[PDB]
Design a protein around this nucleic acid. Structure first.
Lengths: 50, 437, 171, 121, 65
RNA sequence: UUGCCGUUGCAUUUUAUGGC
C-alpha cells in the first residue's frame, strides 16, 4: 500500500534509505532532523533521472 | 685539471659503481619554486611517466629518436593516455596526442589468453616510457599490457598477462635498457623484453598484491606487496630474493618514548623507490617512510607519520544527535585519527633527495644525510591540492648546475580504489614545479 | 609404512573409513605412513619431557622440534611448548597435505576433484608444478597455491578437448 | 564508553584486518551493514567488524543489539577506508562478517582473533 | 622467448678455460637445442661457437628451466 | 590550462584559482 522498473528501483532506494533513517533515529538517544534532510535530498537527486 | 678528472669520473663511472653520488641536498633551494598547476579534465588521471633523452648513451651518438626534446606520458581512469611536451621549462606541459579505449575493445572469445584487441577494456592503471624513446608500455586492470609507439601512439603489440586475475599494477623499466618489470596482482612479477616483444621470466614468491615496483641500472627489482608488511628485493641473474620486513610495534615505540605522542601500527607497505643499488625507501599505510639497505632487515631510518594525520569528522556528521556534548564524545578524542597514508614516492636515482606525496595538498621533499642512515625535510610544495598518483622528476642544465621539473599527477581519488575522506577541492591535473640551482 | 599391532578391529576400521572418506585418500597405507611418522615424532617428543627441564639437550632439541612443527603448521604458535607436541594427532598431519589444503583454498569444490586436478599437473606451489597429493605445504607456502602457468585452468592454451571441439565446431 | 565501545587498538586492528583480507580472498566474508545483519540472523557469522567513523554511527550501531543477542563477538575499527582496502573492494565498507565454515583454511587464525576480541570484551 | 643465464663463472687458466653452471629458461619450448644454445652462448661471450662447449644438461620437473 | 561550470586580463589572447 505505501511507498508511492522505473518505480521498482526507486522503491528499493527509498526502502533502504528509510531503513537507514530508522536506524539513525532509533539508536540516537535524542534524534536530530539534519540527517533526514540529507537523506531526502539524496533520494530526490536519485529520482531526478526521470 | 683535477676538476675535469672528477667530472669525467662522475660522468658514468660513479653510476656504474652504483652508489649515491649526485649530491645536491643543501645545494638545492626549495622555498621559491615555480609551482604551476595544470588542469586536465579527464576523470582521475592515474600515472605520469616522463622520458628525457640521455645524451651520449655511455659511448657517444647523443640519443635515440625530433632531436633533443623531453616528454611525459599520462593515464586517465576513463581510458585515455596523453602525451605531453615538457621540454620548455617554465612553461606549461602542452598536450600533444591522445588515445582512448572504449567498449569496442572487448573481445568475443572472452575466456582465454587472447586479449588481442588493441585498446582497453577498462581502468587503465599505469604507464612507463622506454628510455630509448621508441615505445611506452601501458597496463591496467584489464589484464593486458600494450606497447604504444612514442610518435603516433599506435598499438604496436598487446601483451596479455594470461591470467584470471593478473591486473598489472605498476611497471618499471630497467634504466638504459628495454627490460620491463611489471607487477601483477596475482602475487607475481613479470619480465618483458620490449624489442623482442616477449616475456623473459615470471618470478613468484611474494605473498599478496605486489602493488609497487622500482628498478635501476643493474638487474634489481624492489617490490612491495600490501597486506604482508614486507618488501622483496629481487636479484635476477642469480635468481634469488631478500625479504625485508617491518617490525615497529607501538608498545615498543612507547618504551622508546616513556623516558620523558600518538603513533599506531602498520597496515600495509604501499610505495617504493630505490635511491641506488644499495638503499631503497618505501612508504607504508601508516604514513611511515622507511629507508632500508641491502644488509639489514629492520629499517635503518623510519620517519614517522609523514604527511600528518587526517582531520577528524565534525560534530555534524558523526552521530546525528542534537547535543554537542554527546556529539563531542562520539569523536572519541584522538583515538580514531588515521594518518595520511602516502600514495606515491619517488627518489631521483643516485641522488641526495627524494619526494613523497599523498592527499595533504602538498608534496614533501626530503634529503638523505651524508652517512646514508638518516634523512630529513627540505621544504614543502603546495599547489598539488589532491591525491598524488605518481611523481616523476626531469632535469636539465650543466654538469653541476641543475634545473628540475617535478611532475606529480594529481587526481581526486586513489589510483586503485575510490576511498576518499572528503577530499577538498582536488582538480584532476599535473603539478609541475621548476626548481633550480 | 608400518603395520598396526591388531589391525582388524572394527574401531580401527571405522577410523580408517572416516579419515579416508573425509580427506580423500586411496587406501589405508597413507594413514599408516603419516601415523608412523606421527608416532616417531611424539615418541621422540616424550623422552625429552621425561628428562629434566633446562637440560640443554631438552632445551635445544625441543626448540628444534617445535620450530619444525610450527613451520609445517601442525602446531600453532600460541602453543610453543613440548607437551603440545604430545597433544598433537594425525588429522592435523593430513590436514596439511596439498590435496586437502587446496580444497580448503577453494578452486577445487571437492576433495577428490582436488586430488585429481593435482594429479593432472594443474597446480603449482609458487613456481614448481606438483603432481602428488601427500605434500605437506608449509605455513609460508600456504598462500602460494594457484594453477600452473602451463595449464588451461591457468593461462595457457585451451586443452585437448577444447581445441578438438572448437575444430569440430569450425566444421 | 561512548557508543561504539569495543574499539580495537592498533595491533589488534591490524591483525583483524589481515584476517578480513584473507577471508575475503577465500570468499568467506560478507560485507556491508544489511548483508551483515542478514547473515547474522541466518546464523552463520563468526564475528563481525564495524568501522566506527561512519556517517553517522547508528547505521551500524543497530548491529550490537542483534549480535550480542545471538552471542557472536563484535569489534570496532577506526576507519571505513581501511576496512574497504582490507576487504579488497573499491568503496569504503563499514560492516563485515565472517561466515562460519569448517572447510576454511583460516580457521585457527579466525579462532585466535576471536579469543583476543572476546578477552577485549 | 628463452633466456640463457650463467652462474658461478670461475676461470681456470690451468686449461685456459672458463667454466660455469648455465641455466636456460625456456617458458614454452621443449628444449633449447644444444648447438643453438651453445652458439648463442658464444655470442654472449667473446667468440667461437667451436670453442665453447656445454655438456651437462637436464630439464627440471614441470618444465620451464 | 580544462569534459563541463565560475575568470585576471588585453593595446583577440592573457592568466589561477573553486563546483560536478
Amino acid at each position: 500500500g505505501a511507498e508511492k522498473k522505473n518505480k521498482g528501483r526507486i522503491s528499493r532506494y527509498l526502502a533502504n534509505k528509510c531503513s537507514m533513517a530508522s536506524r539513525i533515529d532509533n539508536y540516537s538517544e535524542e534524534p536530530s532532523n539534519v540527517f533526514g534532510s540529507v537523506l531526502k535530498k539524496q533520494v530526490e537527486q536519485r529520482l531526478e533521472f526521470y | 685539471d683535477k676538476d675535469i678528472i672528477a667530472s669525467r669520473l662522475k660522468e658514468d663511472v660513479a653510476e656504474q659503481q652504483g652508489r649515491v653520488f649526485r649530491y645536491f641536498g643543501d645545494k638545492l633551494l626549495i622555498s621559491e619554486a615555480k609551482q604551476s598547476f595544470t588542469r586536465v579534465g579527464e576523470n582521475n588521471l592515474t600515472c605520469i611517466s616522463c622520458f628525457q633523452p640521455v645524451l651520449n648513451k655511455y659511448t657517444f651518438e647523443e640519443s635515440s629518436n625530433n632531436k633533443g626534446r623531453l616528454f611525459a606520458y599520462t593515464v586517465s581512469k576513463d581510458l585515455q593516455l596523453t602525451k605531453y611536451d615538457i621540454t620548455d621549462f617554465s612553461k606549461r606541459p602542452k598536450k600533444l596526442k591522445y588515445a582512448k579505449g572504449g567498449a569496442k575493445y572487448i573481445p568475443t572469445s572472452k575466456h582465454e589468453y587472447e586479449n588481442t584487441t588493441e585498446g582497453h577494456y577498462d581502468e587503465i592503471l599505469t604507464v612507463a616510457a622506454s628510455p630509448d624513446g621508441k615505445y611506452v608500455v601501458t597496463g591496467g586492470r584489464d589484464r593486458k599490457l600494450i606497447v604504444w609507439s612514442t610518435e603516433s601512439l599506435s598499438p604496436v603489440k598487446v601483451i596479455p598477462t594470461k591470467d584470471r586475475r593478473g591486473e598489472v599494477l605498476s611497471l618499471a623499466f630497467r634504466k638504459n635498457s628495454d627490460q620491463l618489470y611489471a607487477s601483477c596482482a596475482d602475487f607475481k612479477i613479470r619480465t618483458y623484453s620490449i624489442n623482442q616483444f616477449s616475456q623473459l621470466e615470471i618470478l613468484y614468491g611474494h605473498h599478496d598484491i605486489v602493488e609497487d615496483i622500482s628498478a635501476l641500472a643493474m638487474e634489481r627489482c624492489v617490490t612491495v606487496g600490501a597486506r604482508d608488511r614486507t618488501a622483496m628485493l629481487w636479484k635476477i641473474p642469480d635468481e634469488t630474493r631478500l625479504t625485508f620486513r617491518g617490525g615497529d610495534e607501538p608498545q615498543k615505540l612507547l618504551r622508546r618514548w616513556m623516558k620523558e605522542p600518538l603513533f599506531f601500527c602498520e597496515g600495509s607497505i604501499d610505495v617504493v623507490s630505490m635511491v641506488d643499488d644499495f638503499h631503497f625507501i618505501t612508504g607504508s599505510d601508516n604514513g611511515n617512510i622507511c629507508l632500508w639497505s641491502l644488509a639489514k632487515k629492520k629499517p635503518i631510518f623510519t620517519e614517522r607519520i609523514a604527511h600528518g594525520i587526517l582531520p577528524e569528522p565534525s560534530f555534524n556528521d558523526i552521530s546525528g544527535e542534537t547535543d554537542e556534548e554527546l556529539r563531542k564524545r562520539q569523536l572519541q578524542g584522538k583515538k580514531l585519527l588515521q594518518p595520511f597514508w602516502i600514495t606515491s614516492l619517488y627518489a631521483i636515482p643516485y641522488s641526495n633527495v627524494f619526494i613523497s606525496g599523498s592527499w595533504s595538498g602538498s608534496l614533501k621533499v626530503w634529503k638523505i644525510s651524508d652517512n646514508l642512515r638518516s634523512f630529513e625535510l627540505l621544504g614543502e610544495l603546495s599547489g598539488a591540492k589532491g591525491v598524488v598518483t605518481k611523481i616523476q622528476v626531469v632535469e636539465s642544465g650543466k654538469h653541476g648546475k641543475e634545473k628540475f621539473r617535478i611532475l606529480a599527477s594529481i587526481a581526486k581519488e586513489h589510483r586503485l580504489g575510490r576511498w576518499i575522506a572528503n577530499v577538498s577541492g582536488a582538480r584532476n591535473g599535473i603539478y609541475s614545479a621548476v626548481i633550480d640551482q | 609404512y608400518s603395520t598396526p599391532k591388531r589391525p582388524y578391529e572394527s574401531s580401527r576400521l571405522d577410523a580408517e573409513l572416516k579419515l579416508a572418506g573425509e580427506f580423500g585418500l586411496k587406501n589405508k597405507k597413507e594413514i599408516y605412513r603419516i601415523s608412523f611418522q606421527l608416532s616417531k615424532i611424539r615418541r621422540a617428543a616424550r623422552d625429552l619431557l621425561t628428562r629434566d627441564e633446562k637440560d640443554p639437550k631438552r632445551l635445544f632439541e625441543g626448540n628444534a622440534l617445535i620450530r619444525r612443527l610450527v613451520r609445517v603448521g601442525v602446531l600453532s604458535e600460541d602453543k610453543k611448548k613440548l607437551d603440545y607436541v604430545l597433544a598433537l594427532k594425525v588429522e592435523d598431519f593430513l590436514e596439511r597435505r596439498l590435496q586437502t589444503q587446496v580444497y580448503k583454498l577453494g578452486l577445487a569444490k571437492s576433495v577428490h576433484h582436488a586430488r585429481v586436478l593435482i594429479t593432472q599437473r594443474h597446480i603449482a606451489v609458487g613456481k614448481q608444478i606438483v603432481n602428488i597429493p601427500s605434500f605437506m605445504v608449509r605455513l609460508d607456502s600456504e598462500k602460494h597455491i594457484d594453477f600452473a602457468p602451463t595449464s588451461p585452468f591457468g593461462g595457457a592454451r585451451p586443452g585437448r578437448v577444447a581445441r578438438r571441439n572448437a575444430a569440430r565446431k569450425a566444421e | 564508553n561512548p557508543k561504539a565501545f569495543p574499539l580495537a587498538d592498533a595491533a589488534l586492528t591490524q591483525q583483524i584486518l589481515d584476517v578480513v583480507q584473507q577471508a575475503a580472498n577465500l570468499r568467506q566474508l560478507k560485507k556491508g551493514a544489511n548483508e551483515a545483519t542478514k547473515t547474522l540472523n541466518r546464523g552463520i557469522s563468526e564475528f563481525i567488524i564495524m568501522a566506527a567513523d561512519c556517517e553517522p554511527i547508528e547505521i551500524l550501531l543497530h548491529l550490537p543489539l542483534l549480535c550480542e543477542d545471538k552471542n557472536v563477538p563484535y569489534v570496532f575499527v577506526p576507519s571505513r577506508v581501511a576496512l574497504g582496502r582490507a576487504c579488497g573492494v573499491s568503496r569504503p565498507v563499514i560492516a563485515a562478517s565472517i561466515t562460519t565454515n569448517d572447510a576454511s583454511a583460516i580457521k585457527t587464525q579466525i579462532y585466535a582473533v576471536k579469543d583476543k576480541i572476546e578477552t577485549l570484551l | 622467448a628463452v633466456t640463457i643465464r650463467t652462474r658461478k663463472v670461475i676461470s681456470n687458466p690451468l686449461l685456459a678455460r672458463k667454466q660455469f653452471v648455465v641455466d636456460v629458461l625456456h617458458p614454452n619450448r621443449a628444449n633449447v637445442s644444444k648447438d643453438e644454445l651453445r652458439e648463442k652462448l658464444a655470442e654472449v661471450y667473446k667468440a667461437e661457437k667451436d670453442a665453447v662447449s656445454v655438456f651437462g644438461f637436464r630439464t627440471q620437473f614441470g618444465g620451464g628451466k
